[PDB]
Design a protein around this ligand. Structure first.
Ligand SMILES: Oc1ccccc1CN1CCOCC1
Ligand SMILES: Oc1ccccc1CN1CCOCC1
Ligand SMILES: Oc1ccccc1CN1CCOCC1
Ligand SMILES: [Cl-]
Ligand SMILES: [Cl-]
Ligand SMILES: [Cl-]
Lengths: 695, 697
């Protein structure tokens, strides 16, 4: 059910032992010694990874290492397409701007932070949540020259439970992390967008890296003299596999949850955030799909844009399904009513006052938040010409020194980036006509961005004519129109340009709405500190975890499928047979790698197949995970690596607000499938040899 | 494999059925010389199955079987199709025009009689052995002179089985006064609508209720106000015990057609010609149609039924091709024919191998013609609406070329134009569909094989299909209402003889008929060789584990209540519940709206004695019985012969079951009788129907 702090392992240990955990408490997490926690890393600031060899080999997802694989890919050596397999350590590819963070130490500094906070003077100060203020406290506690006296180490204090608990983390960061291996994208991203958030899943979502360090294992930036890190702890790989009901646990860095939302915040999330994103993206995607299906060149240009829009669209659909069917609003209402009743009995009215402040703040910001989401989904991300060039103050104070050419070259560069090889003005006009029609129906005249008032005042309500006029008269409407402007440029032409006025007006309104809404966050945050303090005083910090905040957490559960709907059951494990069932040679997402197809046909599964002779691919578990847990190690009851978390099903996206025992599942790539791909597809035997594989 | 057994085969299957769970005595299910459960089964309205469930002639069948009768009695004031219908007294039950129920009174093996009559052969290649006219002459001879007049309501019919190796004579008792008694709203009767067609899990309460009326002595009589409900020989008892996983289940009904004795070359032809062409052409047609329906709400209204009708056989062809590709259908037919050829070589009889060779050679010879026939039928005859535009008849052309009969010819042509260009016809949508369909057709069919008018695409329009189609509508008398009216004011034969749409329609129909005429002779050598092929299979492995192809005659099938795994890590159980109906509810989607009375019954858990042991309300179940089209409305029986459900569909994964039964995928989709009784009781409030039924605890 939760994403527990490492400090909470002691309190949870007996429940974990009753669920199947076999390893000793301090072998998993030891606050003053080496433990399994020391083999977990925050991979590239947003993913999880794990050390799997005494030579610093690291496993993470394919979608986590995607940028590094793509940056090393060329037409001659397309690693993104065919995979990459370094046959020697010297062949492993260095990566610019990469990092791996180890959580060396974790310490509770709540009393220290609360004592420092007592010197505030302003009772409504937000320093208790300020990264700048908390970093000043972290530096004071660790010492002035801490990073100089302890090379590779840094300190950081984070707030938890809305500012009721503070932890200081001592982090060891390595920046020389080299690409070692990756399967082809046909394995690493098999389902591609069709199978995103989907269980059953047949994706071998993994990639392999290696941490490099100086001669003493200390962090060092990229250098040809760097040597593989000999870590103090690494995961043993299990080949025993998984069975239904087996204990499974994960360690990783979940990003964000909203477990302490009020019922009014659940209503706001559904009726504003989700409904607007769903409505606007459905319109945008609908026009885009029509144009992509009618022109093969439009499909090539808009495929990535369509896919990027669909990602949070599907998340919003899954979240709204949970709000509608799993009683999320009702459960938050019952939670706050229980605290209010308990507060009335104890004679402390501040908990009811805190819930009231949140409700009043949510109700007060409703129209502004609706206007913000409408402009953001409808125009800022919905219409491409909203991000068309806007002349700067320096560029206008150049067109009217001979830096007129410099001002024109800078504007030309931004025009070329806007109207790039993937931009279609005809597709954009069609999308804008549909998006603006919906926007103008939802936003009244007095709340419109100034330029949009011209739809009613100048074009008699004709959205098509307003959009046609923007492109017909704008210097950014076509290449020939920009070149005519660049030959005879004047600031009068730019100041009255219809596209410049549209872009400026919609961005002005977007910023103004952001500025008016920003002050509403603080009273909610301050009231949440009181609300969560009451919940912890009432029911204790035993069965209620702190919201995820990109810090190291553990979660446990079982390998278990679920019933998505009446008479339908999805089991706990998928097989290579399921990959072959989905193969479509003419559908780019479902092409199957010929080497993988041959391994399946010959049943060349070696020691990786299950007891039945079937080759496992992925499994699902009742662990509680979210974004940030991609690449997390999945452990056995013995702490051995059995898989890597890579996704969660759409039915469980509502799990960020309320964990859903009967629907929410972590989607995990089976470690047996990872080794089958390294061995039979990559032929990289040296990686298998350096891992400690247990029978 | 698991089949559609003749009633005659019950004796030799009885021990296997008993070992699979059957508890009733053999002659209580089927007795060739006395009353049995077979006497409670009817062929409903010539294409469905039904069953008698009371001593007063109450009949249950599917909602989609009784659909036309419910629709014919529906008005704006009393919309029975939308809200359901529940007659609260026998006098309130609605009579139906053109309805019938057929009882199979007697079934007799007349193989020796037919084979003796056939020996009076004038031509050894005669097809009289399969001729309904010839077989009816033999049936009348055996029954006697004026059988229908001497025994009113009774009629006789002989049918061929096993490719002409077995003949059965059926004595049928037909009743034509069958009145509508009850029907659930379409929200229950067709809950899944087109989305859930051929789909398991299924949550559709597909049932309707009728009553057989007869004269004072229970004899058939056309509709009369003096008619009285029929007191039948036998009726089904209703079981309330329900079903569990692995329970024995059996069905009796009228499966229409199967192709269990196809050669491997006929399976290849079915896949590579029939199915691939239908799939390709319908995907193009549906694609253009969907794009126009999504862009214009009025086009969606006009083309929704046409789109749905095209999708029905398209989905069936997809499901059939999935079985051919994944379930080794071609390989299993090949093994079957190779086993017969090996056995024939040991028996010293080469005629079985010669018969398979004749089928293979005939299939290979007709390949190009059959490809051309399917290409024109799917691509143009069905694919393009203006292919069925008016063509002036020989008498209409002769009338237009010195009498007042010219105005009659114009009125007849106008009537056909008004039917073609009706309220649902869009010339713009049709032109777009035709451009895409003709582009594919012209790519597949060479110039020398094209219908004459289509040669103009290359010869006159420089390969521009769009211009050719535009010219058809711009210059045709049937291109618009204003163009037809201009023709009707000044009509001439010369205008019609050179009309581009008339020439297109005539040319494509000429080619379609010519191809049909050239292909028709190839059917006979296959049929004659199939008689020899199936005789060999029967002689080799016996009439014990291989059933005759379905031919709209009474058959029984047995199996178990069992779900299946459609794909890796996915399992569909054996039973759906009312909770599944509520999960699918969408108030703004016509297909998935839920009746408020049903939703209230679910919320209050007012399930009475109809709920299962866990308090859940069952809706439908699936079984490993072998069914096909014609089995809609079939009674589903318990091990005791009690009614547990009505068959109403089969899953798409099992459509290949017409060629080879698929044990791990094919399932009959059945409405649970507990759900039927729940709807009659809590939704219709028709207690009198429950009271006349014999319900067993
Ligand atoms: O299989 C994939 C899945 C997701 C992303 C990319 C691929 C690779 N495809 C690239 C071009 O199309 C054929 C292979
Ligand atoms: O100003 C608001 C904005 C969003 C929500 C609620 C209000 C308060 N009221 C003002 C008067 O009109 C009725 C709503
Ligand atoms: O529920 C049905 C299922 C299939 C067909 C027809 C209906 C009835 N609907 C008609 C219009 O939409 C609301 C009811
Ligand atoms: Cl380390
Ligand atoms: Cl012979
Ligand atoms: Cl099968």
């Amino acid at each position: 059910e939760g994403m527990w702090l490492m400090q909470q392992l002691g309190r949870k240990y007996a429940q974990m032992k009753e669920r199947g955990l076999k390893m000793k408490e301090y072998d998993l997490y030891n606050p003053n010694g080496t433990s399994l926690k020391d083999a977990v890393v925050l991979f590239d600031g947003g993913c999880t990874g794990e050390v799997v060899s005494d030579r610093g080999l690291v496993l993470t997802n394919h979608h986590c290492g995607y940028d590094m694989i793509q940056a090393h890919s060329t037409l001659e050596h397309n690693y993104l397409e065919n995979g990459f397999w370094a046959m020697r350590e010297a062949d492993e590819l260095p990566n610019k701007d990469i990092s791996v963070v180890f959580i060396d130490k974790i310490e509770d500094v709540t009393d220290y932070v609360k004592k420092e906070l007592k010197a505030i003077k302003d009772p409504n100060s937000m320093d208790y949540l300020s990264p700048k203020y908390l970093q000043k406290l972290a530096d004071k506690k660790a010492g002035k020259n801490f990073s100089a006296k302890n090379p590779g180490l840094s300190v950081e204090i984070k707030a938890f439970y809305g500012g009721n608990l503070y932890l200081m983390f001592t982090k060891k960061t390595y920046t020389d992390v080299r690409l070692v291996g990756a399967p082809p994208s046909s394995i690493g991203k098999f389902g591609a967008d069709t199978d995103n958030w989907i269980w059953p899943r047949h994706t071998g979502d993994f990639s392999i890296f290696r941490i490099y360090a100086d001669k003493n294992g200390n962090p060092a930036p990229y250098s040809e003299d760097n040597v593989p890190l000999k870590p103090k702890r690494f995961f043993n790989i299990s080949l025993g596999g998984v069975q239904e009901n087996d204990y499974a646990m994960i360690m990783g860095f979940p990003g964000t949850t909203h477990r302490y939302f009020t019922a009014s915040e659940v209503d706001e999330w559904k009726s504003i955030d989700n409904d607007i994103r769903i409505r606007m993206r459905d319109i945008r995607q609908g026009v885009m799909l029509r144009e992509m299906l009618a022109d093969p060149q439009i499909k090539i240009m808009y495929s990535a844009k369509y896919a990027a829009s669909q990602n949070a669209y599907k998340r919003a659909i899954g979240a709204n399904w949970a709000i509608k069917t799993r009683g999320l609003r009702q459960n938050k209402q019952a939670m706050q009513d229980r605290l209010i009743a308990w507060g009335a009995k104890q004679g402390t009215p501040r908990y009811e006052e805190a819930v009231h402040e949140i409700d009043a703040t949510v109700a007060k910001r409703a129209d502004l938040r609706r206007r913000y989401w409408m402009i953001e989904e409808g125009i800022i991300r919905g219409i491409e010409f909203a991000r068309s060039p806007i002349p700067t103050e320096d560029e206008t104070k150049a067109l009217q020194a001979s830096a007129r050419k410099e001002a024109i070259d800078k504007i030309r560069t931004r025009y070329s980036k806007f109207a790039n090889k993937d931009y279609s003005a005809e597709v954009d006009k069609k999308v804008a006509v549909a998006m603006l029609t919906e926007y103008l129906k939802e936003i009244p005249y007095e709340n419109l961005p100034l330029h949009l008032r011209l739809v009613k005042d100048r074009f008699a309500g004709d959205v098509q004519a307003y959009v046609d006029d923007i492109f017909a008269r704008s210097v950014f409407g076509s290449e020939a129109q920009f070149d005519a402007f660049a030959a005879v440029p004047s600031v009068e032409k730019l100041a009255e340009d219809p596209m410049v006025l549209f872009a400026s007006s919609v961005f002005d309104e977007y910023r103004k709405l952001y500025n008016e809404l920003r002050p509403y966050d603080d009273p909610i945050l301050r009231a949440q500190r009181t609300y969560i303090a009451g919940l912890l005083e009432m029911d204790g910090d035993q069965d209620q975890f702190p919201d995820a905040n990109l810090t190291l957490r553990f979660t446990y559960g079982q390998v278990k499928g679920y019933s998505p709907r009446d008479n339908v059951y999805y089991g706990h494990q998928t097989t290579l047979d399921g990959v072959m069932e989905k193969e479509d040679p003419d559908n780019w997402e479902f092409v199957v790698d010929p080497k993988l197809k041959a391994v399946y046909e010959r049943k060349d599964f070696g020691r990786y197949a299950d007891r039945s002779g079937r080759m496992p691919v992925a499994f699902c578990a009742t662990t509680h995970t979210t974004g940030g847990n991609s690449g997390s190690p999945v452990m056995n009851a013995n702490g051995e690596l059995i898989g890597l978390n890579f996704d969660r099903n759409w039915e469980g996206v509502g799990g960020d607000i309320q964990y859903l025992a009967d629907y929410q599942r972590s989607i995990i790539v089976d470690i047996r499938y990872v080794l089958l791909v390294i061995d039979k597809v990559g032929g990289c035997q040296r990686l298998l040899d350096e891992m400690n594989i247990v029978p």
